[PDB]
């Protein structure tokens, strides 16, 4: 049978792909670390409280002006809040309560969103006639969305149920590219700051580095146990950071082809259902479904802190541009802004 | 505060005001849940109740507004999406009786129904049974045997008593049976009593949820 | 976008008008509304204020008592109500569609108003008309009495601009921030109290008297007017 040589390839490959990143590992990180002082202890105060919600959230996104944010819930409202008052910018209702997934254009002019109904919508905020309206559908995905993140005011990457990622422009509605290549349904995503690749991770247990303009996977990320439910870039866009359902986070380069570091302790049994680092890439959050959040040194992997405000599970947060604050949401309907 | 900042506050408290009108009336609607095997007669549920990744059906019935939710046909792993259905008020899980001996269709539907059953986001939820084709079920039996599905049956085979014995080997599959009630009905396509039956089942949620909001659990 | 008003006509002193404003092609419910007088040989005057779902309502303090704002959400118009019609009230109202959260932009358009003709922090615009030869760079100043820069950051000053025969409209809100729909030959500069409109590379439609507003607190106070020639 040729299929069963064909299937040999596959083999002698994966075994040459391990034996040629078993040669890249002299040191680990922890090894280059550790002389350096650690970061301490971390205490954030809960500065601001967003309640207007009344069911679980899902996401969240910073804007880029770092006072500005979205916030999605399954009462079918998504919510644009000034950080700084607490006021309610903008409360648009969804076509469907299904809603997972939340973005805000690095403008500032849109808003996008998606859940269940396999379908990525796009709405305009800075309308000349005053209330905000759909912009766009983004249909032909087939699967549950995960993620949503605007490259552009034109271009939106998007993460699916059907083990597909998917490169959109906005204005014809049409998906110029796609992203084929995972086995399990991908949960997560992540954009390179230059914007010219990004990371996605599925229930695959493995991670994979895209290119946006080619069209196709540059690497494959292997190590978890579990199906890696978020996926976050370090700020010099050379690592990322995954969080899974093996109660651990994992560091991950895109020069050195291999497992860095892994964030992991005896007391938490359960998942990590939101990740993101710090403006320097000291120190990354991970918010889990022991109700908290935690902050770990992500050079020493050491716990720096806990962020214990929420009695239910904590399904996204998010670090500012500036690296002023850090708003962590939940299924109790509350934001909380730390600092 | 300036004079622009008090607009925007009173923009944030009419806000909140649309916001307070449109969470509780979505607190007095019934949400329910279909599930089921690929052909268990679901179309036909969704015919006799109301008259591309999630559908969702709407109609009232008794002065009571039920939104019912068929994801049946979004193909994927169903365990990291089931838990945005915790808090639905009642499942309803179809299955059809006339696809008993079809490639075997029943072990599949009590799979469905052992592990929709005993997830941990509806252990508290009462889930509504129908089965759904009796009439070519009895067209069956008097052609075929129900060794071929249980070789553990021994039983007379006329319409009543296979019928009892595929009730129970579905109302076995709960390791709990104190904390959700499961009520079984038998259904055919012509029937005026299934929608009727779905009421009576939200009833005692609906007691129950009104007991717990009144604070006593 | 379009708000239109009516209601024109002489009166005699001591009568009374509805003047009312249709709005249509916005959200109307979500817009806090306003009326701006213009005498016809001096320049703009602010009367009276409306918010979102009819919450605050501000009138000047040579109009308290005597007129009375209204508006309708579902039917989309706004009505002003005249009692004791003064000799000091012959004038042309424009009604001001605004809207307030951050980063929004107030006072940007303006109906093409209407005439009655009947039978605080002071502004004042540093030149009262400046000779323009095109395509070179013209500074127009203003000056406040108190510092309009707020404690959150602020400044509340609205550089407008009314061409001849023209309603006004928004120029730059907030002494900075550039409107839509205006070009980048605009832009508003500034410090505590000294305000400067620099117009770099002046082009056609450019001449018009020029207006500086202040929306720090409560009542909206203009300048005299700048006219180009």
């Known amino acids: 049978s040729e299929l069963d040589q064909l299937r040999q390839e596959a083999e002698q490959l994966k075994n040459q792909i391990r034996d040629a990143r078993k040669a890249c590992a002299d040191a680990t990180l922890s090894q280059i670390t550790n002389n350096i002082d650690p970061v301490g202890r971390i205490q954030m105060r809960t500065r601001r409280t967003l309640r207007g919600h009344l069911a679980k959230i899902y996401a969240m996104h910073w804007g880029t002006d770092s006072r500005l944010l979205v916030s999605a819930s399954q009462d079918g409202k998504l919510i644009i809040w000034d950080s700084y008052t607490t006021n309610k910018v903008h409360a648009i209702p969804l076509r469907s309560s299904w809603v997972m997934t939340c973005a805000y254009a690095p403008s500032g002019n849109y808003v996008a969103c998606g859940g269940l109904d396999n379908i990525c919508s796009i709405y305009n905020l800075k309308t000349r006639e005053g209330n905000v309206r759909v912009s766009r559908e983004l249909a032909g995905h087939t699967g549950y969305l995960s993620c949503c993140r605007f490259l552009d005011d034109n271009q939106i990457v998007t993460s699916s149920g059907d083990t597909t990622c998917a490169l959109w422009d906005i204005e014809t509605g049409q998906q110029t590219t796609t992203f084929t290549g995972h086995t399990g349904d991908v949960m997560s995503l992540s954009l390179a700051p230059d914007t010219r690749l990004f990371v996605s991770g599925a229930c695959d247990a493995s991670a994979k580095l895209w290119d946006v303009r080619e069209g196709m996977c540059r690497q494959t990320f292997t190590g978890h146990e579990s199906d890696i439910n978020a996926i976050c870039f370090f700020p010099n866009g050379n690592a990322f950071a995954t969080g899974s359902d093996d109660a651990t986070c994992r560091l991950f380069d895109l020069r050195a082809d291999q497992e860095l570091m892994t964030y992991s302790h005896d007391n938490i049994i359960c998942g990590i259902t939101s990740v993101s680092f710090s403006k320097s890439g000291r120190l990354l959050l991970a918010g889990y479904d022991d109700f908290n959040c935690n902050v770990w040194d992500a050079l020493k992997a050491d716990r720096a802190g806990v962020l214990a405000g929420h009695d239910n599970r904590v399904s996204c947060l998010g670090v500012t541009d500036d690296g002023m604050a850090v708003a962590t949401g939940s299924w109790d309907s509350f934001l909380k802004i730390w600092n | 505060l300036s004079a622009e900042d008090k607009a925007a506050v009173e923009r944030s408290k009419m806000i909140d005001r649309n916001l307070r009108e449109d969470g509780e009336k979505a607190a007095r609607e019934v949400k329910l849940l279909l599930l089921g095997a690929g052909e268990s007669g679901k179309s036909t549920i969704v015919k006799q109740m109301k008259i591309t990744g999630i559908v969702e059906t709407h109609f009232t019935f008794k002065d009571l507004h039920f939104k019912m939710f068929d994801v049946g046909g979004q193909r994927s792993e169903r365990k990291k999406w089931i838990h945005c259905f915790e808090g639905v008020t009642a499942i309803i899980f179809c299955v059809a009786l006339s696809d008993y001996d079809l490639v075997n269709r029943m072990h599949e539907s009590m799979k469905l129904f052992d592990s929709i059953c005993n997830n941990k986001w509806f252990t508290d939820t009462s889930i509504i049974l129908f089965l759904n084709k009796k009439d070519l079920f009895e067209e069956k039996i008097k052609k075929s045997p129900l060794t071929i599905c249980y070789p553990e049956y021994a039983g007379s085979n006329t319409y009543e008593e296979a019928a009892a014995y595929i009730q129970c080997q579905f109302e076995d599959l709960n390791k709990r049976k104190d904390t959700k009630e499961i009520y079984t009905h038998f259904t055919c396509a012509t029937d005026t009593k299934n929608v009727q039956f779905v009421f009576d089942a939200v009833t005692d949620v609906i007691i129950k949820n009104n007991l717990k909001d009144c604070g006593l659990f | 976008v379009q708000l239109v008003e009516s209601g024109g006509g002489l009166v005699q002193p001591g009568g009374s008008r509805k003047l009312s404003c249709s709005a249509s092609?916005?959200?109307?419910?979500?817009?806090?509304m306003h009326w701006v007088r213009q005498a016809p040989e001096k320049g703009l005057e602010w009367v009276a204020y409306?918010?979102?779902?009819?919450?605050?309502?501000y009138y000047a303090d040579t109009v308290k008592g005597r007129f009375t704002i209204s508006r309708d959400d579902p039917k989309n118009t706004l009505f002003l109500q005249m009692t004791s019609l003064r000799s000091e009230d012959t004038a042309m109202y424009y009604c001001?569609?605004?809207?307030?959260?951050?980063?929004?932009?107030?006072?940007?358009?303006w109906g093409q108003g209407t005439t009655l003709t009947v039978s605080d922090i002071v502004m004042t615009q540093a030149t009262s008309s400046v000779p323009v030869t095109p395509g070179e760079s013209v500074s127009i100043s203003c000056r406040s009495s108190?510092?309009?820069?707020?404690?959150?950051?602020?400044?509340?000053l609205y550089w407008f601009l009314q061409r001849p025969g023209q309603s006004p409209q928004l120029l730059i809100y907030?002494?900075?921030n550039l409107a839509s729909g205006v070009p980048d030959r605009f832009s508003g500069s500034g410090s505590g109290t000294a305000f400067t409109l620099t117009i770099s590379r002046l082009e056609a439609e450019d001449v018009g008297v020029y207006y500086c507003?202040?929306?720090?607190?409560?009542?909206?106070?203009f300048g005299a007017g700048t006219k180009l020639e």
């Open positions: 092609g916005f959200a109307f419910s979500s817009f806090g």
């Open positions: 409306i918010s979102s779902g009819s919450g605050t309502i």
């Open positions: 108190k510092s309009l820069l707020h404690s959150n950051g602020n400044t509340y």
């Open positions: 907030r002494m900075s």
């Open positions: 507003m202040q929306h720090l607190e409560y009542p909206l106070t």
């Open positions: 001001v569609r605004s809207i307030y959260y951050y980063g929004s932009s107030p006072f940007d358009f």
